[PDB]
């Protein structure tokens, strides 16, 4: 049998064909491969955009226009790439939520580099949104890069060193395009290490109980379910591309960047609004920035906060409710982030901001200790 | 060697010679009455007078 | 015999009135079942074609 | 644009290639704007 | 969590203390030297120049 | 990695299975399917719905206040 | 580029101001001429 | 310009109010607005640099 | 602002029709393979 | 002994039925997260409890795949839930703590 | 011992530390790692050039000029990248010649993908030399792309489809820059499969006779020889960069 002994097809076999997998993993386990597909789509649409895009402020806005009007089928490539990025962040957030609800974070190595995979995608989509060089691109790029000015002593030096000047200008757009090109390949490399550590143990499953007593081969059972899921992923993408391309995009980005005046109200893309809300919830520069970093780096210390003698929340009602109060709370912070710093959105943004950190750090750890005592162990 | 290597590479990202050469600005002052703020262009960033 | 995939195997054609059981049976170590079934089916397919 | 402000009392007519996409409401906004002029309400006095 | 506080673990701490404080001298001196931190490098006599 | 034949130990468990060409891929899809969906939502609705209703109430109040907070008062 | 190779900054500045170069637009949208500064490239003798 | 509580400058991005002299009073902003090194030569004239 | 308007809707119609075909067929392939497992029966017969 | 520690059991019976692993024919000790201590305790189980534990878990993963549960007649009754693993598990922990106390001498 | 059991450091261990290697491989076996180094140099110098280069005919020539004059230490980055490419081809040709003289081609899988590694590097350096958009860049790009017009029946279609026009112009320079950016990462992926098939057997040696009777660990013996070789590789590069940058370049 050559499938099991060829040094190249051996690694494919042990990952997609004869890999033992649990027999009961639900649709929430489909998002791992949809992330891979999303990445592949962003490579290909991204690559075919880079063959017609130019990286300088004078014609960066116009080269994207040139794609949507003049090159054959470039407008569809461009909206696939724009909406593909948003589908990427849908899958990312389901992927993480699956890991929290069902306790998959106990795979420390897999989980802790998963956090790294989250940061690098954010850094990618950030440096992608700058490239069309619209108004939102420019000033969104200005707010973000100035976060480093809050670091004491060395702040301004790192910002102007990143900028290559005294503000985001021609030098930034060129290097950001270079970074946006190369990072998605680094991502693919780390995603391969994601799987390598994963296969060390195999998948968790909805129950949190070892599935060694009842495994099925990945092929044909999860190859076909991953196809079906991908076909629903294409459906989601194409509905956005072909019936609502500017639903998630802001209108202000359709006016060339102006370094002299801002829009009266700026809002990130939806997938960053929850974190922008946390930033604005503090009337301090360095405080807001640190609260923004810990908002995402909180994931790295979830495994240290596991108190339950059970792994999944499937059998933990009191943790379920606190889990869904976090989704609603995160859905609240997303709403505030899309609204102007005005009454009562300000005070709401602070209460939802505490509730975020309060749930993860206090309410959920102690909630697991209670239900352990309710079960007499 | 590794220092000079890394030093010359990070310095490449710093602003080039043509970015530090942006000249200064003259402003005709009789343009502006009392109680008004007019904005000008200097080093790419606004200049409020 | 070369790769030591089984202790024994035998083909059979069990006949009954208007039906029967045609196939094979074997005995092997727990890590050899897949290889035995691969080679077995491969020979059925090879004789079919 | 500097010549444009001088020819339009200091205001800049924007490029229209993308006007429907760069303003919330698209043609609903533009249609309502063009056809929506009216006398100022009591108490609002616009500069010449 | 508190496995690591007792007679033997405080002995291990005091055994490796002289070493860790030296690796802090490597890092600290290595940080000054790499970044050319002038606030420190003025009092040391010979490198003063350029 | 991990292989079949080195996972775990199992004894005295029998599994009966039918070929996929001998059975129906959609058996009682609506007959047994819908009652199972009702049981599944019934069993979890009280754990999921409240926090999202709580969000709905904050969302309408906050906009309702903001949408009129910039209205004018006679004073 | 001449500064600190073969002329001082003051010398090279005085050298740049010995020629007139185009700049603008001003607030009226017109192009105009001013003396060179250190940041100007050497004047081209022909437009094309 | 000429907006905010202090009748000077207001920043809509996150809500930082300045006064007529550019000094921060309310907001997450930590410092007053920067002033360059300038000087007045004649009456209707000014240089920034 | 959107010259591709008409062409994208024509494609959108074709995308909906193909999905209305492919989604239940691919769903049917999933259920076909999985039926071996969904109707499997287990029995535990320990020695006494 | 009293009526106050009896509704205490009533809320623990309540949490038990809400947790719902009894709906899959499972027992509390079937759901413990396997760490090194638990894997040792399972290793020490006699053949009958090990084989029973294997089948109950297999029966539940089967049900979980189909998103089904057992009839109410076949649910694990809170009164009949044998904590079969905690005796073995408590001795594993006791041994580990002894090693840890020796390790700091 | 954690070096042998951590799933990540395991693959490093079996490739650079405890890997059995012959005891008699000469300096001609140093060029495998020098190819890897050359690749890394072309990634880094290449990346830091791409932060200041613009990809359109009007200013493509000028952006390279902008690097050699205005950006701090960009002229040295640029000549490293230009001469690094030539050092890459020196190492390639020694690597192949080693394989032919000593018969290493009998490793079919390793060898046959080595051929693929040769073609992709040529395709890279080709699409790199177009980017500065000089005279040699343009007409060298014209002669090459017209080779496809010789294919019967479908020739002209493939050329004009590659061109995005009726001759090499703005559309080609943009896509060639995109291809030149992405190909060196594909190369690194195939170079990893190069090693994977190699480790299946281990290295050949000057004699052509199996060295199983006398192997030494790769570390410290060939880690240090690969360092020494790399230090001679830097010497070759820096002599070209700092004393003769336009010796191989055409005026
Ligand atoms: C599109 C947005 C949909 C959001 C997902 C809502 C939850 C869901 O039903 O997941 C379906 C689907 C079913 O997966 P599963 O493996 O069968 O169960 C997963 C959980 O264990 C499911 O947890 P559970 O076992 O506790 O059961 C929850 C229940 C939820 O059931 C419902 O709430 C549907 C009730 C609608 C009744 C019909 C009214 C019309 O799931 C179902 O019964 C299947 C949905 C049937 C839909 C029928 C619609 C007609 O799960 C997902 O795909 C989740 C990701 C969907 C995000 C898509 C956004 C792009
Ligand atoms: C962003 C993209 C996110 C991708 C998510 C990945 C989803 C995935 O890969 O797994 C699909 C996963 C596969 O479900 P399954 O293979 O049937 O097994 C479900 C369990 O066995 C559960 O067993 P069960 O007996 O409780 O199943 C209940 C039955 C749903 O029961 C019903 O009959 C509800 C329909 C009410 C309509 C009333 C008309 C009379 O099946 C479903 O829950 C699927 C709902 C889809 C209904 C589509 C209309 C047909 O669930 C789905 O969402 C299927 C949607 C496929 C579209 C079919 C369109 C034709
Ligand atoms: C593009 C870059 C290409 C990279 C190539 C990679 C080269 C490599 O990795 O292996 C170096 C490889 C290492 O040779 P080895 O470790 O000595 O072993 C040689 C055999 O054992 C052979 O044993 P042997 O006893 O026959 O050795 C003869 C002896 C050479 O015998 C001599 O003494 C000739 C020198 C005549 C000078 C007369 C003055 C009196 O050593 C050599 O052949 C090396 C010649 C380097 C002479 C540099 C001046 C010292 O050969 C070299 O080329 C060494 C050059 C290192 C530069 C040293 C500068 C100080
Ligand atoms: C080098 C090659 C790189 C390619 C990389 C591709 C990246 C993957 C993106 C997937 C997008 C989905 C379809 C959008 C196009 C469109 O909408 O199709 C529009 C065309 C009509 O077109 P028309 O009327 O203009 O012409 C008409 C001329 N006769 O019919 C359709 O509706 C087909 C779409 C049906 C529904 C999609 C189902 C998806 C199945 C999976 C196939 C994926 C294959 C991947 C191959 C690499
Ligand atoms: C940091 C990023 C912030 C960005 C803000 C994004 C806006 C949020 C918008 C909300 C969309 C919610 C999606 C719909 C979820 C429906 C779930 C449901 O129907 O069933 C509950 C299910 C219970 O099922 P059991 O697994 O317990 O057992 C089944 C027995 N038959 O239990 C499960 O299925 C739960 C599995 C996990 C769900 C994933 C959703 C969470 C998304 C964000 C999490 C980020 C946390 C840091
Ligand atoms: C580009 C980014 C990512 C890719 C391509 C990716 C891909 C995958 C895949 C294919 C799986 C196995 C199949 C599955 O469970 O769906 C998986 C599992 C996992 N991932 Fe990711 N992932 C990414 C990011 C993340 C992030 C952001 C996190 C957490 C913060 C994470 C943590 C995990 C964990 C804990 C598992 C194990 C889940 C289980 O088996 O139960 N990963 N990932
Ligand atoms: C995970 C991978 C990626 C993500 C999430 C991503 C995301 C994005 C986003 C959100 C934009 C903004 C689009 C817009 O506002 O119009 C963008 C633009 C762009 N991306 Fe990417 N991208 C990825 C990979 C790539 C790759 C690999 C390339 C090239 C090889 C690329 C090339 C481009 C180009 C040229 C643009 C500017 C054109 C445009 O704005 O449409 N992208 N990207
Ligand atoms: C980017 C391109 C390449 C890289 C990074 C690379 C790298 C390497 C390395 C590190 C080795 C093992 C150490 C050594 O023998 O030096 C090796 C061996 C080998 N390579 Fe390559 N190589 C490349 C291209 C090629 C080419 C173009 C060929 C042939 C046409 C080739 C054929 C071989 C063979 C046959 C061996 C085995 C040599 C032996 O062990 O005796 N490779 N390569
Ligand atoms: C094996 C890898 C590579 C080789 C052999 C290579 C080779 C070359 C060559 C020969 C040139 C012509 C230089 C000149 O004539 O001035 C060039 C230019 C260029 N390369 Fe590469 N390159 C490689 C990888 C890369 C990568 C990975 C990048 C970017 C991420 C890159 C970016 C550039 C740029 C921007 C130019 C134009 C600037 C210039 O001409 O100096 N290269 N390359
Ligand atoms: C983490 C990356 C650090 C980057 C620092 C940098 O680019 O160099 C600037 C200063 C220069 O020293 P100084 O005496 O001019 O001082 C100038 C003060 N602005 O060097 C430092 O002060 C080194 C500080 C390192 C702390 C982690
Ligand atoms: C660079 S402009 C930008 N990039 C995005 C896509 C992004 C930011 C951060 C992380 C990932 C992606 C985003 O939402 N914005 N907009 C924006 C608007 C206001 C403030 C900040 C950003
Ligand atoms: Cl646009
Ligand atoms: Cl040049």
JSON list of N, CA and C in Angstrom, two decimals, chain A residues 323-340:
[
{"chain": "A", "resi": 323, "resn": "UNK", "atom": "N", "xyz": [-21.54, 32.07, 29.77]},
{"chain": "A", "resi": 323, "resn": "UNK", "atom": "CA", "xyz": [-20.93, 32.08, 28.44]},
{"chain": "A", "resi": 323, "resn": "UNK", "atom": "C", "xyz": [-21.75, 32.93, 27.48]},
{"chain": "A", "resi": 324, "resn": "UNK", "atom": "N", "xyz": [-23.08, 32.81, 27.53]},
{"chain": "A", "resi": 324, "resn": "UNK", "atom": "CA", "xyz": [-23.92, 33.56, 26.61]},
{"chain": "A", "resi": 324, "resn": "UNK", "atom": "C", "xyz": [-24.08, 35.01, 27.03]},
{"chain": "A", "resi": 325, "resn": "UNK", "atom": "N", "xyz": [-23.95, 35.31, 28.33]},
{"chain": "A", "resi": 325, "resn": "UNK", "atom": "CA", "xyz": [-23.83, 36.69, 28.76]},
{"chain": "A", "resi": 325, "resn": "UNK", "atom": "C", "xyz": [-22.55, 37.34, 28.25]},
{"chain": "A", "resi": 326, "resn": "UNK", "atom": "N", "xyz": [-21.54, 36.54, 27.93]},
{"chain": "A", "resi": 326, "resn": "UNK", "atom": "CA", "xyz": [-20.33, 37.09, 27.33]},
{"chain": "A", "resi": 326, "resn": "UNK", "atom": "C", "xyz": [-20.52, 37.38, 25.85]},
{"chain": "A", "resi": 327, "resn": "UNK", "atom": "N", "xyz": [-21.26, 36.52, 25.14]},
{"chain": "A", "resi": 327, "resn": "UNK", "atom": "CA", "xyz": [-21.54, 36.77, 23.73]},
{"chain": "A", "resi": 327, "resn": "UNK", "atom": "C", "xyz": [-22.41, 38.01, 23.59]},
{"chain": "A", "resi": 328, "resn": "UNK", "atom": "N", "xyz": [-23.46, 38.11, 24.41]},
{"chain": "A", "resi": 328, "resn": "UNK", "atom": "CA", "xyz": [-24.29, 39.31, 24.41]},
{"chain": "A", "resi": 328, "resn": "UNK", "atom": "C", "xyz": [-23.47, 40.53, 24.81]},
{"chain": "A", "resi": 329, "resn": "UNK", "atom": "N", "xyz": [-22.62, 40.39, 25.83]},
{"chain": "A", "resi": 329, "resn": "UNK", "atom": "CA", "xyz": [-21.77, 41.50, 26.25]},
{"chain": "A", "resi": 329, "resn": "UNK", "atom": "C", "xyz": [-20.81, 41.89, 25.14]},
{"chain": "A", "resi": 330, "resn": "UNK", "atom": "N", "xyz": [-20.26, 40.91, 24.42]},
{"chain": "A", "resi": 330, "resn": "UNK", "atom": "CA", "xyz": [-19.40, 41.22, 23.29]},
{"chain": "A", "resi": 330, "resn": "UNK", "atom": "C", "xyz": [-20.21, 41.82, 22.15]},
{"chain": "A", "resi": 331, "resn": "UNK", "atom": "N", "xyz": [-21.43, 41.33, 21.95]},
{"chain": "A", "resi": 331, "resn": "UNK", "atom": "CA", "xyz": [-22.33, 41.94, 20.98]},
{"chain": "A", "resi": 331, "resn": "UNK", "atom": "C", "xyz": [-22.71, 43.36, 21.38]},
{"chain": "A", "resi": 332, "resn": "UNK", "atom": "N", "xyz": [-22.76, 43.64, 22.69]},
{"chain": "A", "resi": 332, "resn": "UNK", "atom": "CA", "xyz": [-22.99, 45.01, 23.16]},
{"chain": "A", "resi": 332, "resn": "UNK", "atom": "C", "xyz": [-21.79, 45.90, 22.84]},
{"chain": "A", "resi": 333, "resn": "UNK", "atom": "N", "xyz": [-20.58, 45.44, 23.17]},
{"chain": "A", "resi": 333, "resn": "UNK", "atom": "CA", "xyz": [-19.39, 46.24, 22.90]},
{"chain": "A", "resi": 333, "resn": "UNK", "atom": "C", "xyz": [-19.22, 46.51, 21.41]},
{"chain": "A", "resi": 334, "resn": "UNK", "atom": "N", "xyz": [-19.65, 45.58, 20.56]},
{"chain": "A", "resi": 334, "resn": "UNK", "atom": "CA", "xyz": [-19.63, 45.81, 19.12]},
{"chain": "A", "resi": 334, "resn": "UNK", "atom": "C", "xyz": [-20.56, 46.97, 18.76]},
{"chain": "A", "resi": 335, "resn": "UNK", "atom": "N", "xyz": [-21.74, 47.03, 19.39]},
{"chain": "A", "resi": 335, "resn": "UNK", "atom": "CA", "xyz": [-22.68, 48.10, 19.10]},
{"chain": "A", "resi": 335, "resn": "UNK", "atom": "C", "xyz": [-22.12, 49.46, 19.52]},
{"chain": "A", "resi": 336, "resn": "UNK", "atom": "N", "xyz": [-21.60, 49.56, 20.75]},
{"chain": "A", "resi": 336, "resn": "UNK", "atom": "CA", "xyz": [-20.99, 50.81, 21.22]},
{"chain": "A", "resi": 336, "resn": "UNK", "atom": "C", "xyz": [-19.87, 51.24, 20.29]},
{"chain": "A", "resi": 337, "resn": "UNK", "atom": "N", "xyz": [-19.01, 50.29, 19.90]},
{"chain": "A", "resi": 337, "resn": "UNK", "atom": "CA", "xyz": [-17.88, 50.62, 19.04]},
{"chain": "A", "resi": 337, "resn": "UNK", "atom": "C", "xyz": [-18.29, 51.25, 17.72]},
{"chain": "A", "resi": 338, "resn": "UNK", "atom": "N", "xyz": [-19.49, 50.96, 17.24]},
{"chain": "A", "resi": 338, "resn": "UNK", "atom": "CA", "xyz": [-20.03, 51.54, 16.03]},
{"chain": "A", "resi": 338, "resn": "UNK", "atom": "C", "xyz": [-20.80, 52.83, 16.23]},
{"chain": "A", "resi": 339, "resn": "UNK", "atom": "N", "xyz": [-20.78, 53.39, 17.43]},
{"chain": "A", "resi": 339, "resn": "UNK", "atom": "CA", "xyz": [-21.56, 54.56, 17.79]},
{"chain": "A", "resi": 339, "resn": "UNK", "atom": "C", "xyz": [-20.64, 55.66, 18.31]},
{"chain": "A", "resi": 340, "resn": "UNK", "atom": "N", "xyz": [-21.05, 56.93, 18.22]},
{"chain": "A", "resi": 340, "resn": "UNK", "atom": "CA", "xyz": [-20.17, 58.02, 18.63]},
{"chain": "A", "resi": 340, "resn": "UNK", "atom": "C", "xyz": [-20.10, 58.17, 20.15]}
]
